[PDB]
Subunit: 159 residues, 6 copies
């Protein structure tokens, strides 16, 4: 059979933890669609278009990975992609179970499947990544060199 | 004896999960006062007056339920209502135990009693409800038809 | 109205934390029935009869508190006592939510209400109490003097 | 592609919660192998052979589900089945993350994927199921009629 | 040996819970540096300078306690103080483990050590403290009299 | 100043996670006493004497680490060692906070300090280690070669 899985997120920016999940999920499912949510309410540091370019630079080499943005409901993005799985990361839960439970009513034949990144990525926080970068600290332990470049450029252009 | 219980919350808007707690709590206590907190700091989607009308439309049929707003301290609302119980919902906790623990010093003879909604309401998040509704998605699985109407009207009037 | 609440537990032995919950719950409900579960599978340190005497010595002075044992299903003990509330303690949950959720199917009109003991009793563990007492350490910070006597006698009679 | 997933567990007995996970997982993966672990150390109420018959009676109608026992390491059962996924249930975690984390070292190309059962099965505990059944209470809300029969027979034969 | 420990935080304002940790940590380590983080992003109620004065008024009597502000990276504040320990409070964790885990990469020879305040301070929330004070409620159960004065003055000057 | 810290545990057997905590704690405190608890009630796989030899083989090279057994109360072992700190590991808590909270009453001037092992050891479970070893699986990812030898010998001698 052919199974498409969606991995949605704000990805502000894509971290080594997100990337590791992408590697892992994409070896299981036929197609893995990385869905970059507009996330207007969260006031993301990078624009949607920047977040797509960031993610594409890191992920473009995976042959069965598509990176796409969405501005609307996850329901509509999942159906559009003929997807029967939503992948989400769990690190060692409030939000995730609510989201999954509500998606059981909104997308009744879609399965949310929780995956866990490698040990070394378990403790990466996006908020802490952005904060460190905005204070001029390097986050190359947490994001790829291409992403660090984007962070440096945006912080410099902000100040 | 006569026991009045207060069930306070932002209720932005009242969900089927809140409503289920109201049903359950009001069959135990003589009077159940639903206290709608102004919650100015949270920047609620609906105004206090709208949140009261919303809640009254859903709850008015329960004979021992009162719906009232408050703009001040919970302590003052609880005393005003001669209440010896504060009801709060727990779903499967940081905030709730802090709030209860601090209320043990502020309201020493008042008992916080935690109740849990039916299975089907365990995963409803208010934040997700508002977000879905603001993106034009229906939330009738999570709120009553009267509440969906309010949501549709406010989203239309916002845009 | 008249509301009877059951507070069930193994109580091996009744701690200051259990006692504090009893005080608190019994000021709210008309009758509070402390239900001592036989708990055969847990292999309790004290026998059921000893656990009843222990609890009665501590609680007998509360006029609306009954202490009773049960060897069967909680369902049958709750119905017998015309109870519409089960009180359980929460300290800062796996077991408690499963138990409550399963009781929603077994006892559909009964409400489980979770209460939290005073600050100073939040960290008492029964297992640690028994272990300390079995090693000859005093647990008077955690159980009343009458209970310490029972513990000392049983540990001496064991060895 | 062809993806085999293993869903291992003690299954003492298979509950409606396990069954729901099986339904869900087996609509995603090509083959879903239910692995019944011997679990000698847990002293299971039913024997391995009984647990297999129990599970087969409930699951035999699913065309891509295999029910098999294993007495050895999960590693060996997973490899035997050419499986690249281990499915595990999460309800609203200590054990599960340890198990998954240790399996990342033991089975480096195998992905543990956590799934969550429908709302109505979120609160079923196996321990509580067995305890109720051993006290003569019906657990038909928690296990299928075929499983209730097995429970009744074993409890009667124990006493 | 000589061991300096840093206890960093927003301290908006210093509570009795923070103060208790300071007392406890400073009896173990030779020097305890209380690091007041600028925390611009959190939009703190008090300015950095106010938060330093607040903390100094309460803590100045401890002979081996230094109170200092920092506007940059924790890494730079920790190195500046020749510190090999970061002290953090735990009450009965998401943020704290991420922060500690990320600090293992940023400060590889520095140990994060988690301490827990006395029972009576376990449930104090800073957010609730500020909210109560902004509504005109007294928080003397949660902060020292000197801190209550600062809160009263700032709330009066805000309105 | 001179500060002795105790790190107590069952250590059945000492894992790479325990060892990492020992390394970390012993670079901070002047003396680190590893206290091997008899733990009779837990029915440990190795005897106390075996657990001491196991731990000494791994830890003997650390100059400020002492490995000692204790059969009585932790209180008595801590006082004997003039210790003002108890070190405990946290991985990403019920037991640990109860233990610490009860120790606040039993050892009022002693501080429990929680430390967290490196990323790669966060998911090691002792129970899973023993179970794997008893089924004939290698646990060299989780324990040092010297410990694997002990495990192999004991499993062979059991069967
Ligand atoms: C954006 C959505 C999907 C939420 O994703 P989120 O903002 O949490 O993405 P984020 O970039 O934070 O992370 C992406 C995923 O990886 C996980 N993750 C975070 N850090 C790590 C790490 N170090 N390792 C592994 N995984 C991680 C996150 O938990 C999440 O599962 C949600 O807002 C959404 O779908 N909204 C769209 C509109 C809608 O329909 N809303 C209703 C949702 S029910
Ligand atoms: C508004 C208060 C009470 C907090 O309530 P909150 O904003 O969390 O209300 P909310 O609408 O989110 O929910 C109401 C209650 O139902 C619970 N709940 C939420 N979702 C669900 C669900 N699906 N099912 C059942 N219960 C639920 C909430 O946990 C809460 O217990 C608090 O801010 C307050 O009392 N402030 C007033 C001023 C004051 O004195 N502050 C000090 C407080 S100690
Ligand atoms: C005995 C029952 C009720 C479980 O109770 P338990 O053994 O956990 O009792 P225990 O003595 O440990 O504690 C009693 C209550 O006080 C709570 N508690 C424990 N410590 C403290 C403390 N320091 N402060 C406050 N509360 C506390 C416990 O969480 C529990 O809520 C359960 O086994 C039962 O009801 N079985 C009877 C047969 C049956 O029908 N089984 C099905 C149950 S759904
Ligand atoms: C048996 C194993 C897999 C553990 O499974 P466990 O005993 O927890 O199975 P159990 O019957 O309890 O449940 C099966 C699965 O469904 C989950 N589950 C439990 N209740 C529910 C419910 N109501 N709804 C959904 N899922 C549920 C469980 O969490 C588990 O994921 C483990 O012991 C094992 O694999 N051992 C074999 C030897 C080995 O290699 N050991 C090392 C393991 S790393
Ligand atoms: C300010 C920092 C340290 C986070 O601290 P935080 O804002 O949580 O401080 P806060 O005042 O809330 O509390 C201080 C400490 O005491 C703890 N605490 C809170 N309440 C209590 C209580 N009642 N009892 C005991 N401890 C408590 C907090 O958990 C925290 O450990 C963090 O933002 C930081 O270090 N930033 C600086 C720049 C940087 O390098 N960022 C990267 C961090 S990895
Ligand atoms: C033995 C004691 C200390 C409890 O220790 P425990 O049995 O949990 O030890 P264990 O070997 O499991 O682990 C030792 C420590 O390292 C931690 N740890 C476990 N795994 C890991 C890991 N992978 N990485 C880091 N730390 C870990 C444990 O949480 C514990 O903190 C306790 O029983 C005790 O002190 N009893 C003695 C008598 C007494 O006075 N009892 C009262 C106690 S209040």
């Amino acid at each position: 059979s052919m199974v498409v899985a969606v991995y949605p997120g704000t990805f502000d920016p894509l971290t080594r933890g997100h990337e590791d999940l992408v590697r892992r999920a994409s070896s299981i499912f036929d197609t893995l669609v990385v869905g970059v949510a507009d996330s207007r309410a969260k006031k993301p540091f990078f624009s949607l278009e920047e977040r797509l370019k960031i993610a594409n630079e890191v992920l473009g080499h995976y042959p069965n990975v598509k990176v796409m943005g969405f501005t609307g409901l996850l329901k509509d993005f999942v159906r559009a992609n003929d997807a029967r799985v939503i992948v989400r990361g769990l690190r060692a839960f409030e939000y995730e179970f609510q989201m999954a439970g509500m998606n059981r009513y909104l997308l009744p034949d879609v399965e949310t499947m929780f995956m866990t990144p490698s040990d070394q990525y378990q403790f990466i926080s996006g908020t802490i990544v952005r904060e460190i970068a905005q204070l001029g600290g390097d986050v190359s332990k947490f994001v790829f060199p291409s992403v660090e470049k984007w962070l440096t450029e945006k912080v410099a252009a902000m100040a």
